[PDB]
Amino acid sequence: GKKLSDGWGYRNFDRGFFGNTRYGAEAPRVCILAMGWNDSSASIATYRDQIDKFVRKAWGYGCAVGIVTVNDNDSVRMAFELSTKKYMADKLGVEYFNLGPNLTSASSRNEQTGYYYYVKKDGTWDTTHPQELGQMAMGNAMYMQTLGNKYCRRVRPGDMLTQAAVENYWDCVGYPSGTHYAPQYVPVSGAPALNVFRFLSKCVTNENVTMTTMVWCEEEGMTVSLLEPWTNAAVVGQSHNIRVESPVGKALFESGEYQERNTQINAYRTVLNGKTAMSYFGGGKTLTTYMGRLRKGLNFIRYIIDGSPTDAYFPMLKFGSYKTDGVKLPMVRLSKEPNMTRPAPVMKQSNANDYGVFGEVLSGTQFSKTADSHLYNGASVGYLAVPRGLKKNTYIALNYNPLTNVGVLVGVNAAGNMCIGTFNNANPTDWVVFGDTTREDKGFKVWEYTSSSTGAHTFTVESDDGTATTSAFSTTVATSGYVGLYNPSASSQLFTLEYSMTIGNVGLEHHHHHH
Amino acid sequence: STSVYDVPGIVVNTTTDNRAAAYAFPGKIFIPNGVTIRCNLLPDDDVRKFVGEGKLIVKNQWYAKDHTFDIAASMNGNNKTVNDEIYCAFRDQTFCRIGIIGDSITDGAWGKQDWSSPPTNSDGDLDAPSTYNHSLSGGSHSWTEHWMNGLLLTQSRRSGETIYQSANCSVSGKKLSDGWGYRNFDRGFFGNTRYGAEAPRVCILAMGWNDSSASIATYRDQIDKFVRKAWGYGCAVGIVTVNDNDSVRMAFELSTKKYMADKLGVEYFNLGPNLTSASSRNEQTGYYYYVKKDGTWDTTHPQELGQMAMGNAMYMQTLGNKYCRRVRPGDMLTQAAVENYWDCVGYPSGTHYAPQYVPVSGAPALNVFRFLSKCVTNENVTMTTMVWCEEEGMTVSLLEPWTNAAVVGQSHNIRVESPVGKALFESGEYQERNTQINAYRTVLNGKTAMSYFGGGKTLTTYMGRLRKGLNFIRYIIDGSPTDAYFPMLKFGSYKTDGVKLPMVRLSKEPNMTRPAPVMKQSNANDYGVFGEVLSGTQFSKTADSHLYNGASVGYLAVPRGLKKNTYIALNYNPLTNVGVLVGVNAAGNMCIGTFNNANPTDWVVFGDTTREDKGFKVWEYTSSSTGAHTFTVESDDGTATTSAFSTTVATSGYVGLYNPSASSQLFTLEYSMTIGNVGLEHHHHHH
C-alpha cells in the first residue's frame, strides 16, 4: 500500500536501513528500488523526479543502486514502468531489471498454471500479487540477471553439462560434517568408458554428499538424463537419488496453518524425483539414468550419494525433448558378413558424433542408445520386430555396448530353436532356448520391460504364429546399448527389423496366464 | 563562441529577425540560459551556429505560426526516446505523430505496384505549403505504414482513437550528403498542415542507401547536423537502417548511422535482419520479395511482402517489445493478461471492450481453468492478437474454453496473416497482383470447432503452420453472443505435431467400468484439456476439429486382436469420461460405439462371432462438412468390416484401454494421427 509518489520510499530508506540494527543500522551494500505498481495516477514527470531523488540519496550513502520492475501483467503499468523506471535507469546509468517476462513464462505454461499462479485462497483472481510459484519465478529471473548470468548455463535440447569446469556449476556438501568440498580433476583409465573420459572430476569426502546445480531451460518440453561416470565402490541398494525442482526458491514450510497447501505446492514444484542407476547396479560401472521433463526457466537439481563414499564423482547431464526422446529405428533390411564373433550396431554415426557412452542416450533416433535405468522404471516399452524371422545361428542384438562388447542376443540357434541370452564379451553361457526346431525364417516380436524393484531388463519373445514364447530371460548386466546384428554363421545373411523404445512415466503391467 | 550581446547587428528581443546578422557573423553564437531571441532560420541554415542554453523564436515560412528552437537540447540532447514517446502515448492516450525523413525504400518502393513519391517542386524539394499525406497516397504501403498498422492494432486493445499517425517525408533519389534531408525537415513538417505544420513528436532518420560515395566523416557530420536540428525542435530522435542486402552498405551503415546513434545517445533500429528472414524462407520467396513487375531483380527496393517485413521489425523493436510475445514450439498463450495481447471490437457497434476475469465451474474442463477471461458484448466480436515466431516451421492450435450459448452453424472462424501489414487494395489497376499477394500472406484460414459442435463445450482446433517473424491472428465470433471468451493458443512444430504411439504390449486389470489412457504423464505436465493437443507424442491428445478437415488420418493397429468383452478406446477424455470403444463383445463379434460416461447404447456390431484374438485396423477420418469423426474398421482376414460409425460427441481425447471382462488381459496396439491439409477421399464399393 505504500507509494513512491508519496515520498514513503525516500523517507523509509533512512528508517528501514539506518533504523534497523539487524539490517546493520547502515546503508546497505546494494540498494534496490522495486516500487512502481501503486503509483500510476501520478505524472510521468512526478515519478521520474521521485526516482531521481531516491537514487541520489542512495548514491550519496554509498549504495550500489538497481531499479527493478517485478510484474508485467497490467497493460498500462508496463508502459508506465517503461517511461519512468526503465527511462531513469538508463538516464542515471544504473542497472535495470525486469522480472515480468519469466513470471509470464512460468504462469503461462499450460491451461492450469493460471490457477496456481493467480488464484488467491479466497478463490479470487489476482495477477498483481502472484501466488507462491509466481514469487519464486520472479526471484529466479532476478537470480538469472545477476550471478546466474555467469554461474548458470542456458540450455536447449542437445546440450550437455560435462565434467569440465564443474566448480562453476556444482557444489559438493558432505553430511553430516557440512564440509563444502572442492572439485579435483583426476585421470581415469582401465575400463572402456573411462578411456573415453580420460579425466573426471570428483571430491574426496569419506562421507555422504549432496551435489547441487542449476540450469536455465530456454524452452518448454525439455528433458534431462543423468550420467554417473564411475560408480567406484558403490554397493547395490544404497539410496543414491536425484530430484529436480522448478521454479526454484525457499521451500514452503511443511508445517503450521497452511501445511497442506504448502505440501501441495512443493510437490508441484518437484517435477522429477527417484533412484539413480548406481543404486540399482552398484560399483565399478558407468551408468545412465533417464529422468524426464524440466520446466522453462530456472531448474534446481539435487543429487545425493549414500553409503559414505571415499570418492564422489560429479555427474554429467544431457538435455533433450519429450517430443523426440526415445530410440527410433524404422524398418531396415540389410545383409551382414559371415563368421563374426562380435555383434555390430545396425546404424552407426561418426565417432566424433557419438563415442557410445552418453551423447546419444534416448536421443530419439536410429542411432540412439537406451539407458540403464529410469527415474520412473517399469513404465517404458522396448519393441523389436523381425517380420521375416532369421536364419539359423543368426541373431539380433539388443542393448549392445560396442565399448564393453556386452549385449543381449535373440534369434535362431543352429538347431533351429528360438533363443535369448547374454553376450558377455563372449558367446552366451546362459542361453534361454524355447519353441520347436523349425523357427528359421519365421517372424517374431520382442518386448522389453524394466523392473522398478531391481532395475532388471526383462524380455518377452513371441513368434508371430503364436507357437513359441518365453519371458524367462532377465538381465542386470546388459542393461543399455544399441541395436545390433550378429552373424556367426558361415554364410552372408539378410536381416529385416525395426526397433522402438517408448518412454513412459506411470508404471505398467505386462503379465498374463497360460489359460 | 561569441556572446550574443557582443555580435554586430543582433537585437535581443522577440520581434527583430536576427537571421541576417547571425549568419553574416562568421563564428559561433552563445545565447545564455533564460534568453530568447527571434531568429527566423531558413531550412539550409546550420543550427549548430548557436551554442549555450537559450532559445530561438523561429517563424514558420509557410504558415502564420512560430516555433521554438531549444539550443540547450540541440547542444546536449533532449534525452527523449522514440520508445519512450510511443509507450507514453499508449499510456496517456495522447496523439503521437511519427515523422520519417528517408529515401526511396522508405518512400514506398515497392510496397505496392502503383507507388509514387510525395509532390516536389522544381528545385526538387517537398512542396510547401501542403495538405499532402503520403500514407493516404503513393506511400500507402511503405514499411512505415505497416509499422503504423502494428502500433494501431496494439492501440486497439485500449481504444478506437487513432493516436499513431505517420508523416512520411521520404523521396526516391534524395541524399543526406546533399543536405536534402536537413532542408526538408522544415519543409516537410513545418510546411505541411496535414502533418500538423510543426515538428513531429517522433522523428526518424531513415536515409543511408543513396550516400555511399561520400566520406564516413562527411556522412557523420550530416547525421550530427540533422539530429541536433530535430533535438532543438523537440523531437524524440531515432535512426533506422532499413535494408541489409548490400555488402558494402551494411559496413557503411554501421560506421555512420549505428556509430552516430551510439555516440549521440539516440535509439538505433535495423529492419534488415527480418527482411532477410522473411525473404529467405525458401527457394521461391526470393521471387516474391525481390522481383519487380518488369521481371528484373531488385534487393534494394523490396516488393510488398518485403515492405511489410521491414515494418514488422520496426513494430517489434517498439511497442511489440512488451506487447507481443516471442514464441517457440511448446509455448502457450493463456487466459492470463489477455488485455496485454488481445483486443475485442464489437460489430457493428465498433465498441472496444475491456476483458473481465470471471470464475468458472460446473464442468470438468472449467474446474481446470477456475478462471477465464471474457467480454460482455451482446454482439458479434473480432478478437485480434499478434505473436512473434522465433523459428520457421512453427504451428498453432486454438482452444475455445467455453462455447456458452453458441449454436451449430454460426460462422466462427480464425485467420492468420504473415507477414503483417496494411492489406493491399483489392481493387484498381493491380487488383489481381494485390489479391495474389494478400492470399499468399494469409497462411491459415477456416471455421473453428465451436462452429461445428456448438455451445456448452470446451473445444480445440488445429490450425497449422505459421511464419518466422510477426503473425497476425484474427478471431471472429458470430451469432451475437452475450459472452465472448478469449481463446488460448498452443504452439508446436509441423515436424513433430500429431499423435504417435509406437507398438506397446501391456496387460490391464479386470472389471473396469471406465477406460484408462494407455500412456499417462504427471498431472502437472498435462491435465488433459489443451497442453498436449497434437503435440506428437505417445501422450498426445487429438483435436476436435481442424481448420483443414477431411485431410488427416487416424490409424489404430491391433495386430493380435482382443479377448471378448475387451476394447481399445479412441478419443477418450478422462475428464468427461467420454470416448469411442472398439473391440470384441461378449458374443465374439466386432463392435464400435460411444462410451458416453457409461457403456455404449449405440453399439455398431459386425462380423461373425469368432473375432477373438484376430487382428484388425481402425481408420479415423473427419468431415469438413459436419466435423464428425468417422471410423472404418477392418479385420486383417478381410471378413469383418464397417464404416457405419460416426460421432460428433467423442471428437477428441487419448488412446485408452477398457477391460470390463472378469479376467486380466493383454493389449497390443499402436496408434498414429497424421495431419494433412488437402482434403482426401476414402470410399470404395463392395464390388
Ligand SMILES: [Cl-]
Ligand atoms: Cl501496494
Ligand SMILES: [Cl-]
Ligand atoms: Cl497512483
Ligand SMILES: [Cl-]
Ligand atoms: Cl551531445
Ligand SMILES: [Cl-]
Ligand atoms: Cl515550383
Ligand SMILES: [Cl-]
Ligand atoms: Cl533513393
Ligand SMILES: [Cl-]
Ligand atoms: Cl553517394
